């Protein structure tokens, strides 16, 4: 039923009654032919109306209507972008770009609409309001592929941190969609990793891990000195320095990406595990942190890193032994699990062995059976150990 | 001359010094001098 | 010549009697009121001869701050407050304000038992001074009168330890009193955001879980065999940390040996610690719902009247001070079944109550200050870390001695206003490295940098329209001349404006060309070119280019 | 500049305010009065509710159950949300929670909307809110009644329903209780804040909470851009209450004032009804009956216990026990103890001495109060009959209070005493209506009444006031008492649910810094105001604008002094004459003409470079640098 809308909405009042009725309509689903009818009449009322908030609601439910399951949205999309060009209100423009993003998600097959939406996104990318740029960047990330990379990377230096975060997440979205990235954006990532707004740093450390995975054997020189070094190892150094950052969520992210990376030379692993450039003693800082989430993430990163590099496993055994006296029982249980995973191929010495065994008196039966499971996989040096 | 008048207004609004600063020598002053 | 003027009366190159006077902008702020443990020949108190001689103090000092309840950071509070006669604001955290009175009264008991009684204070002065203090919450900005703000962060030295950020105008100085980024069992690590201050004051007086494991192994072995342990601990923070560590170890091991403590002082400290839980570890805060960690079942008396046998009993003590009955080693014991941990088993365990070099380096990197100031430690170690800061972090530092005025230059920023129309136009026109030409109506201490047109109402935008005349001998059509001049300029000037104008005129940048009426002489024809100071550099070249003239 | 009012409830307000380049959603209140239309959730199913008769509309009869001529839906209680579809919640950036009463519905917004921003709330607000959501969930899912009531929500079908259901608003938007997974997930996204803490929001906006005084943790928010201060007064209290008192000083010089959370039933003095509550329970227990007090686990129970524990010792009622049965009873009591620094001056003075702030620790130590996590834990064995029992939910639609009403409802010697005013008391007893057990409506609301808000408003003096429309029209029960009105020199514009307000507080200035390096590169000249001009370059980072080193034309030249100064420096043949389009001064030395009209001064000269240089230098010498 759409003729009812055709009567009542043009015979209503402007400020709130139209808005309240429009809100009422959003709670019922629509059928595709009626979807075409409603997008047509809503475009008509969008033409006639001048209020910003009512147009914002018009656009947001137009986006909710395009989300409907079965229909073709391109035909109405043509006129939709036709009016998007002359629209001036910034909130309404951001909402329109939300809808066109919804159409791009809806129909990712036709390339014609893809280039079209990329063109309109780049057209409105000079907008002052940060929300419109946010939606432009989301549109670039979701739709594109093989000119988008340099466009998004130019917005890495945008003043608003929300815009920078959206740009980085757009590149991450592009890589997730399966594009080979560039080695150039490493520098811009490094720049943003240096003093930003927490969310930006979290997304940036995600991005620098992504490019490190993409170009691990590449060569990038030291900025001050002249010594060459494989790219993945300086990426490891840059991520490792973020373990000391004052935002615990970024610390957790950095620990997870530390665990992910595996092509690191054992030199830097020994450097980052030894207590007594900026990648010295990062893991000990992670294990000596106050957030148990950071410690769990760090010990899991230790498990994965030792699993990838068998020779690394010898140096972390004693540190894991200390974690069996941890305060949080989940941390102790996780350290026991890591030890069982990595002590498979290596040997314990006497002091480490008895310190492992001395915690058996603990009341928590779960860590007791976990420790038993460790002992199924441990290796003993001398018969006195047994 | 906006730097000069603003800096003069800011410095002139200062109210009172104290014993150690005027009598300091080489940016340092001695304590417990009564001995 | 603006400045930040700083003078440490104490703890500049020593440990003890933290007292640093600060002048940031006109106002004078006093940083700590500690006392010097060691000498008692009137160097036990700060020398206020720097700032006053037979007079009142509040005339100069605008605030007094306390880092924490340590005697070397707050012990000289009542003497300076009432004995010398300070009657102004005092700011310290709530747990510091709660713990400081009884500790200072115990030190006053110590002094009167040593019988100072010659330059010392009494309990009633403490009761008077403590009514004069204004407590500060964590992360709370305290505007005092009109422009000075004080913000207190977390430090982790003790319960209620804080590092302060004193602000006036755009200039700030961060005083990291006493901290340690190696968090203990019962407290978190110091955190301060990227405040990027113009001055940072830091203390510099210098396998933790491995040490804790060794301690607990010794305790477990002794109570298993039957050794009667003893812990002569002076610090209340260290005592409470050892208490919670022993409590959690015994809870994990599920054994029922008793633990003792001082009936008088430790009871009050435990009560206050239980009260002030949100300052503690995140583990303690998270586990507080299930049960109370400071309501530990091992809350036994001082002893079983000093007759609990030398077996597996556990106790607490203090070194040569007001602690608990160490009736363990000599009264009981006398044999192998005893172990005394004083920082028949002799041992000494070192606990990181104060910070290390790496923690200081991390703090300075985290804050990112313009300058660093060092206090509270051994001068050799100050030199060591000053060399480390100058080498690694490439930031200037100062090392002061007592009575040394470290003074720093400043770069205050002038806050002024903009018209949002001009700002919006500048952003809109610039984002698709040019200049921003504006005009400021610097009124009586209230500035306003607006566009020129905005000044019209306040008359005073009475426009000054310029015009430079160009001598051209041609008499051709206006539209043809304008089109040819536009094409010639687009050829000469490299892509300034490529556009067909509606009125058949010329304008490059923001100049204005008019084919005005010529003079009274019939043999003279002149073209006129109007512009502004913004575009005069191109307008002069445009007029010099057209000085040759169109083809006559 | 634009205010979006998601929820129309006066005391549970969800408002999205788009300020400058940001947007902040103030409070997230869950309109919980919707549950009153539902049948309660008895812990043990009772024959009385089970054998209730269905309401035959015209034939669906199983869907509605009728009690005492009042129709209730037979399903799990459902809660009304803020109007979420009005504004895309992905666009909002920050959520500010004033008090734990507005803390609810946060899981709805945070998980079910794609919202990704942050939340700022005080530490006691977060902890008490966690307990409140925990106990509410534990009440809802304890005896899960199947969700079946959806056919009654249809429009025409709802029209035929009677008055208790006819007035239900946004019925389709009503949602079941969130799970504990949603509560735990949502509460992870909160940054704890402290009173009077300047929290930057991308630089463009600074938000500062201030002690509200209504409850521990409760805060009032102020939003600034160094030129546009926007206050937000949620529920507050000027009375002699134990939390930290109102800080009206920080509220001053406010451009607008979003005012919410005033007193329900403002006719009542709180202390008089505290006395009425104590006296009523006293005569009840002395008669022999039992007293049931449906209360929130943390809201008003602390001061109530204070007054009651004074009263029983004074009146020798120490014989009777005090039962506080709630799943979060112990946690609420301990949280109340440990939050001494968030209290008023007297309590923190008490904790300066070795003493807990609240007295119910002494009540437990004297073994008068006896809290329990549930009826069946140990209260099922330690309970003696003449007693006072603080439990459950004040909605009376879930919790242990429901079982207690079904238990003591039959007798007349017992009594229920209501304290919470946010639920209509006559609607709460409606599903248990044919009961002989005495009900007392003595609300203990401590919010700002209209005379206190009038005094507050006249002290702070905001340029505008934004309030719910319920505060601009007199309450329907009164409808003639104009003392329950808010008035000012502005008319204090209002808002209904799902309404947008355009504000006139769109002042057009922004602060900007200049360092001495660029300050020294400016040339002022005052003529009594300083007339100065600067052409510099603007670089903006993180919504903070800065000017770095890399003019304009303005001036009023009278003709006569122009001529005199030119003659003084030395020049020839300067005219004074009055022609059309303005007075014009002529300089025929090298064909230079200057026209002086009003608001403009046209200057004509030639391309002779040194003539132009000399003229510019001389004019800028006489005309002050501008
Ligand atoms: Zn200390
Ligand atoms: Zn110290």
UniProtKB/Swiss-Prot annotation, chain A:
Chain coiled-coil ranges: none
Compartments it resides in: Nucleus; Cytoplasm
Highest taxon above the source species: Eukaryota
Similarity remark: Belongs to the Integrator subunit 4 family.
Subunit structure: Component of the Integrator complex, composed of core subunits INTS1, INTS2, INTS3, INTS4, INTS5, INTS6, INTS7, INTS8, INTS9/RC74, INTS10, INTS11/CPSF3L, INTS12, INTS13, INTS14 and INTS15. The core complex associates with protein phosphatase 2A subunits PPP2CA and PPP2R1A, to form the Integrator-PP2A (INTAC) complex. INTS4 is part of the RNA endonuclease subcomplex, composed of INTS4, INTS9, INTS11 and inositol hexakisphosphate (InsP6). Interacts with BRAT1; interaction is required for the assembly of the RNA endonuclease subcomplex.
Biological function: Component of the integrator complex, a multiprotein complex that terminates RNA polymerase II (Pol II) transcription in the promoter-proximal region of genes.
Protein name from the UniProt record: Integrator complex subunit 4
Gene giving rise to this polypeptide: INTS4
UniProtKB/Swiss-Prot annotation, chain B:
Residues of the full protein shown: 655 to 689 of 706
Subcellular location, record wording: Nucleus; Cytoplasm
Region called Cleavage module binding motif (CMBM), residue ranges: 1-35
Assembly and oligomerization: Component of the Integrator complex, composed of core subunits INTS1, INTS2, INTS3, INTS4, INTS5, INTS6, INTS7, INTS8, INTS9/RC74, INTS10, INTS11/CPSF3L, INTS12, INTS13, INTS14 and INTS15. The core complex associates with protein phosphatase 2A subunits PPP2CA and PPP2R1A, to form the Integrator-PP2A (INTAC) complex. INTS13 is part of the tail subcomplex, composed of INTS10, INTS13, INTS14 and INTS15. Interacts with transcription factors ZNF609 and ZNF655. Interacts with PAFAH1B1; this interaction may be required for proper recruitment of dynein complexes to the nuclear envelope at prophase.
Regions crossing the membrane: none
Function: Component of the integrator complex, a multiprotein complex that terminates RNA polymerase II (Pol II) transcription in the promoter-proximal region of genes.
Domain notes: The cleavage module binding motif (CMBM) mediates recruitment of transcription factors.
Family affiliation: Belongs to the Integrator subunit 13 family.
Tissue: Widely expressed. Tends to be up-regulated in seminomas compared to normal testis.
Name of the protein this chain belongs to: Integrator complex subunit 13
Phosphoserine: modified positions: 24
Curated annotation (Swiss-Prot), chain C:
Catalytic site: 203
Outcome of substituting residue 369 to S: In NEDMLOB; uncertain significance
Chief localisation class: nucleus
Annotated disulfide bonds: none
Family: Belongs to the metallo-beta-lactamase superfamily. RNA-metabolizing metallo-beta-lactamase-like family. INTS11 subfamily.
Activity regulation info: The RNA endonuclease activity is inhibited by BRAT1 that forms hyrogen bond and hydrophobic interactions with the active site.
Keywords from the named record: Cytoplasm, Hydrolase, Intellectual disability, Isopeptide bond, Metal-binding, Nucleus, Ubl conjugation, Zinc
Effect of residue 213 to Q: In NEDMLOB; abolished interaction with WDR73
Cofactor section: Zn(2+)
Chain positions recorded as Zn(2+) 2 binding sites: 72-73, 178, 376
Gene Ontology molecular function: RNA endonuclease activity
Result of altering residue 55 to S: In NEDMLOB; uncertain significance; may affect function; the orthologous mutation in Ints11-deficient Drosophila is unable to rescue locomotor defects
Pfam families per record: Beta-Casp, IntS11_C, Lactamase_B_6, RMMBL
Binding positions for 1D-myo-inositol hexakisphosphate per the UniProt entry: 424
Post-translational modification note: Sumoylated; sumoylation regulates its subcellular location and is required for integrator complex integrity.
Protein's recorded name: Integrator complex subunit 11
Known function: RNA endonuclease component of the integrator complex, a multiprotein complex that terminates RNA polymerase II (Pol II) transcription in the promoter-proximal region of genes.
Origin species: Homo sapiens (Human)
Record InterPro entries: Beta_Casp, INTS11-like_MBL-fold, IntS11_C, MBL, Metallo-B-lactamas, RibonucZ/Hydroxyglut_hydro, RMMBL
Residues at which Zn(2+) 1 binds: 68, 70, 157, 178
GO biological process, one term: snRNA processing
UniProt short sequence motif HXHXDH motif, positions renumbered to this chain: 68-73
Superkingdom: Eukaryota
Curated annotation (Swiss-Prot), chain D:
Cross-link (Glycyl lysine isopeptide (Lys-Gly) (interchain with G-Cter in SUMO2)): 58
Keyword set includes Nucleus: yes
Cellular localisation: Nucleus; Cytoplasm
Gene Ontology BP annotations: negative regulation of transforming growth factor beta receptor signaling pathway; regulation of transcription elongation by RNA polymerase II; RNA polymerase II transcription initiation surveillance; snRNA 3'-end processing; snRNA processing
Example of a GO cellular component annotation carried by this entry: cytosol
Keywords: Cytoplasm, Isopeptide bond, Nucleus, Ubl conjugation
Domain of life: Eukaryota
Residues annotated as binding 1D-myo-inositol hexakisphosphate: 2, 19, 506-507
Pfam families: Beta-Casp (PF10996), IntS9_C (PF21382), Lactamase_B_6 (PF16661)
Outcome of swapping residue 612 to E: Abolished interaction with INTS11
CDD domains membership: Int9-like_MBL-fold (cd16294)
Gene3D superfamilies in UniProt: 3.40.50.10890, Ribonuclease Z/Hydroxyacylglutathione hydrolase-like (3.60.15.10)
InterPro entries attached to this UniProt entry: Beta_Casp, Integrator_9su, IntS9-like_C, Metallo-B-lactamas, RibonucZ/Hydroxyglut_hydro
Recorded family membership: Belongs to the metallo-beta-lactamase superfamily. RNA-metabolizing metallo-beta-lactamase-like family. INTS9 subfamily.
Additional information: Although strongly related to RNA-specific endonuclease proteins, it lacks the HXHXDH motif that binds zinc and participates in the catalytic center. Its function as endonuclease is therefore unsure.
Functional description taken from the UniProt entry: Component of the integrator complex, a multiprotein complex that terminates RNA polymerase II (Pol II) transcription in the promoter-proximal region of genes.
The protein's name: Integrator complex subunit 9
Organism name: Homo sapiens (Human)
Source organism phylogeny: Eukaryota, Metazoa, Chordata, Craniata, Vertebrata
Designated gene of the protein: INTS9
């Amino acid at each position: 039923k759409s003729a009812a809308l055709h009567i009542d909405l043009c015979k209503a009042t402007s400020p709130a009654d139209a808005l309240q009725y429009l809100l009422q309509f959003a709670r019922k689903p629509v059928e595709a032919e009626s979807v075409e009818g409603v997008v047509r009449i809503l475009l008509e009322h969008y033409y006639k109306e001048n209020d910003p908030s009512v147009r914002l609601k018009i656009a947001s439910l137009l986006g909710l209507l395009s989300k409907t399951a079965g229909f073709s949205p391109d035909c109405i999309m043509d006129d939709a972008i036709n009016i998007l060009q002359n629209e001036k209100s910034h909130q309404v423009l951001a909402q329109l770009l939300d809808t066109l993003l919804a159409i791009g998600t809806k129909l990712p097959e036709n390339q014609a609409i893809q280039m079209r939406l990329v063109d309109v996104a780049c057209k409105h990318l000079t907008d002052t309001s940060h929300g419109v740029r946010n939606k432009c960047l989301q549109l670039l990330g979701n739709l594109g592929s093989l000119d988008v990379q340099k466009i998004i990377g130019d917005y890495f230096s945008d003043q608003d941190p929300r815009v920078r975060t959206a740009a980085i997440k757009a590149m991450l979205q592009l890589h997730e969609r399966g594009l080979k990235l560039h080695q150039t954006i490493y520098n811009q990532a490094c720049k943003l990793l240096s003093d930003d707004y927490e969310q930006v740093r979290s997304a940036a450390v995600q991005l620098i891990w992504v490019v490190s995975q993409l170009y691990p054997e590449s060569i990038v020189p030291i900025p001050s000195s002249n010594e060459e070094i494989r790219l993945v190892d300086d990426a490891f150094g840059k991520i490792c320095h973020m373990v000391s950052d004052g935002s615990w969520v970024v610390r957790v992210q950095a620990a997870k990406l530390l665990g992910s990376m595996e092509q690191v030379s054992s030199h830097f692993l020994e450097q980052t595990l030894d207590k007594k450039s900026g990648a010295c003693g990062a893991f000990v800082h992670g294990l000596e942190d106050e957030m148990y989430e950071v410690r769990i993430a760090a010990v899991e990163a230790l498990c994965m890193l030792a699993q990838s590099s068998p020779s690394f496993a010898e140096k972390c055994l004693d540190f894991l032994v200390d974690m069996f006296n941890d305060e949080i029982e989940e941390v102790r249980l996780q350290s026991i699990h890591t030890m069982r995973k990595i002590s498979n191929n290596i040997t314990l010495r006497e002091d480490q062995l008895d310190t492992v065994l001395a915690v058996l008196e603990d009341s928590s039966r779960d860590i007791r059976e976990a420790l038993h499971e460790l002992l199924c996989c441990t290796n003993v040096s001398t018969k006195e150990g047994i | 001359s906006l730097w000069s008048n603003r800096i003069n207004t800011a410095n002139s609004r200062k109210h009172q010094e104290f014993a150690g600063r005027l009598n300091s020598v080489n940016n340092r002053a001695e304590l417990y001098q009564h001995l | 010549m603006p400045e930040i003027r700083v003078t440490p009366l104490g703890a500049g190159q020593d440990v003890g009697r933290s007292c640093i006077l600060v002048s940031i902008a006109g106002k004078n702020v006093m940083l700590d009121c500690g006392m010097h443990m060691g000498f008692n020949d009137d160097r036990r108190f700060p020398d206020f001869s720097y700032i006053t001689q037979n007079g009142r103090l509040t005339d100069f000092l605008d605030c007094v701050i306390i880092s924490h309840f340590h005697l070397d950071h707050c012990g000289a509070l009542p003497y300076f407050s009432e004995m010398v006669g300070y009657d102004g604001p005092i700011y310290m955290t709530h747990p510091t304000q709660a713990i400081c009175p009884i500790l200072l009264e115990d030190y006053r008991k110590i002094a009167v038992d040593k019988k100072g009684e010659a330059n010392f204070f009494t309990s009633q002065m403490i009761k008077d001074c403590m009514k004069k203090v204004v407590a500060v919450h964590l992360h709370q900005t305290v505007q005092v009168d009109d422009e000075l703000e004080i913000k207190a962060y977390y430090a982790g030295h003790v319960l209620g330890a804080a590092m302060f950020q004193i602000k006036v105008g755009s200039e700030s100085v961060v005083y990291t009193g006493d901290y340690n980024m190696t968090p203990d069992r019962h407290l978190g690590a110091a955190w301060i955001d990227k405040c990027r201050p113009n001055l940072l004051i830091t203390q510099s007086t210098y396998s933790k879980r491995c040490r804790e494991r060794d301690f607990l192994k010794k305790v477990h072995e002794t109570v298993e065999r039957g050794g009667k342990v003893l812990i002569p601990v002076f610090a209340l923070g260290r005592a409470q940390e050892l208490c919670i560590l022993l409590e959690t170890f015994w809870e994990r091991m599920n054994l029922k040996v008793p633990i003792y403590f001082s009936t008088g002082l430790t009871e009050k400290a435990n009560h206050y610690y239980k009260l002030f839980i949100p300052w503690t570890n995140q583990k303690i805060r998270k586990t507080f719902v299930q049960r109370n960690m400071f309501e530990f079942k091992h809350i036994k008396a001082f002893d079983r009247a000093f007759a609990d046998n030398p077996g597996p009993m556990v106790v607490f003590a203090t070194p040569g001070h007001a602690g608990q009955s160490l009736q363990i080693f000599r009264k009981w014991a006398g044999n192998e079944k005893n172990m005394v941990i004083m920082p028949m088993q002799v041992e000494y365990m070192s606990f990181s109550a104060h910070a290390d070099a790496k923690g200081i380096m991390q703090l300075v990197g985290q804050a990112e200050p313009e300058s660093v100031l060092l206090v509270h430690g051994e001068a050799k170690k100050m030199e060591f870390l000053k060399q480390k800061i100058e080498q690694e972090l490439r930031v200037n530092c100062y090392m002061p001695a007592n009575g040394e005025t470290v003074t720093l230059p400043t770069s205050p920023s002038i806050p002024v206003g903009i018209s949002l129309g001009l700002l919006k136009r500048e952003m809109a026109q610039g984002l698709l490295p040019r200049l921003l030409h504006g005009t400021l109506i610097m009124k009586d201490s209230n500035f306003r940098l607006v566009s020129s047109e905005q000044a019209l109402k306040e008359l005073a935008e009475h426009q000054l329209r310029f015009t430079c005349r160009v001598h051209l001998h041609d008499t051709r059509k206006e539209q043809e001349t304008a089109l040819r001049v536009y094409s010639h300029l687009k050829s000469v000037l490299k892509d300034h404006c490529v556009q067909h104008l509606p009125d058949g005129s010329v304008t490059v940048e923001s100049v204005l060309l008019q084919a005005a009426a010529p003079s009274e002489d019939p043999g003279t024809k002149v073209l006129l070119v109007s512009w502004t100071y913004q575009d005069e550099e191109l307008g002069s070249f445009l007029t010099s280019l057209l000085k040759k003239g169109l083809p006559q | 500049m634009k205010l979006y009012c998601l929820s129309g409830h006066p005391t549970l307000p969800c408002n999205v305010l788009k300020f400058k380049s940001t947007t902040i959603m103030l409070d997230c209140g869950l309109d919980m009065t919707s549950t009153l239309n539902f049948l309660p959730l008895p812990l043990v199913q009772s024959p009385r509710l089970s054998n209730l008769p269905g309401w035959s509309l015209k034939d669906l009869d199983k869907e509605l159950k009728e009690c005492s001529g009042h129709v209730f839906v037979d399903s799990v209680p459902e809660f009304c949300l803020p109007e979420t579809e009005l504004i895309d919640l992905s666009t909002v950036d920050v959520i500010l929670i004033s008090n734990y009463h507005c803390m609810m519905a946060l899981p709805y917004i945070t998980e079910h909307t794609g919202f990704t921003g942050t939340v700022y709330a005080t530490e006691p607000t977060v902890q008490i809110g966690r307990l409140l959501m925990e106990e509410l969930v534990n009440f809802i899912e304890r005896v899960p009644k199947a969700q079946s009531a959806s056919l009654w929500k249809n429009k025409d079908i709802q029209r035929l329903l009677p008055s208790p259901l006819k007035d239900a608003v946004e019925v389709s938007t009503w949602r079941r209780c969130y799970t504990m997974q949603e509560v735990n997930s949502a509460l992870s996204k909160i940054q704890l804040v402290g009173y009077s803490q300047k929290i930057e929001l991308f630089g463009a906006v600074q938000v500062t909470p201030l002690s509200s005084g209504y409850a521990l943790g409760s805060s009032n928010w102020i939003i600034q851009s160094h030129y546009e201060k926007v206050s937000y007064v949620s529920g507050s209290s000027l009375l002699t209450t134990h939390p930290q008192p109102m800080d009206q000083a920080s509220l001053k010089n406010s451009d607008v004032l979003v005012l919410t959370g005033l007193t329900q039933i403002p006719t009542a003095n709180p202390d008089g009804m505290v006395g009425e509550f104590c006296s009523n329970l006293a005569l009840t227990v002395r008669n022999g009956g039992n007293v049931l007090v449906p209360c929130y686990p943390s809201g008003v129970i602390y001061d109530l216990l204070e007054c009651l524990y004074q009263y029983i010792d004074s009146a020798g009622l120490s014989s009777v026990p005090l039962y506080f049965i709630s799943p979060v009873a112990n946690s609420s009591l301990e949280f109340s103890q440990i939050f001494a620094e968030w209290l008023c001056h007297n309590k923190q003075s008490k904790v300066y001495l070795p003493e807990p702030p609240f007295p119910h620790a002494e009540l437990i130590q004297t073994n008068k109060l006896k809290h329990y996590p549930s009826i069946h834990g140990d209260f099922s064995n330690d309970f003696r009959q003449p007693c006072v029992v603080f439990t459950g939910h004040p909605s009376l639609r879930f919790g242990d209070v429901v079982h207690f009403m079904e238990l003591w409802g039959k007798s007349s010697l017992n009594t229920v005493i209501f304290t919470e005013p946010d639920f209509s008391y006559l609607e709460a007893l409606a599903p248990y209506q044919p009961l002989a057990m005495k009900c007392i409506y003595c609300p203990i609301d401590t919010r700002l009444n209209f005379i206190q808000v009038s005094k507050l408003l006249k002290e702070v003096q905001p340029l505008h006031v934004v309030c719910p429309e319920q505060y601009t029209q007199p309450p329907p029960a009164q409808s003639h008492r104009m003392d329950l009105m808010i008035d000012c020199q502005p008319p204090a514009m209002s808002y209904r649910r799902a309404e947008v307000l355009a504000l006139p507080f769109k002042r057009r200035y922004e602060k900007i810094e200049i360092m001495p390096e660029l300050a020294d590169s400016l040339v002022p000249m005052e003529i009594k105001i300083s007339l100065a001009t600067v052409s510099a370059v603007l670089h903006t980072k993180d919504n903070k604008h800065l000017l770095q080193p890399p003019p304009l034309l303005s001036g009023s030249i009278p003709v006569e002094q122009f001529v005199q100064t030119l003659e003084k420096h030395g020049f020839s043949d300067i005219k004074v004459e009055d022609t059309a389009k303005g007075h014009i001064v002529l300089l025929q030395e090298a064909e230079t003409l200057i026209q002086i009209e009003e608001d403009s001064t046209h200057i004509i000269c030639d391309n002779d470079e040194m003539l132009r240089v000399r003229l510019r230098d001389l004019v800028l010498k006489f005309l002050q640098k501008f």
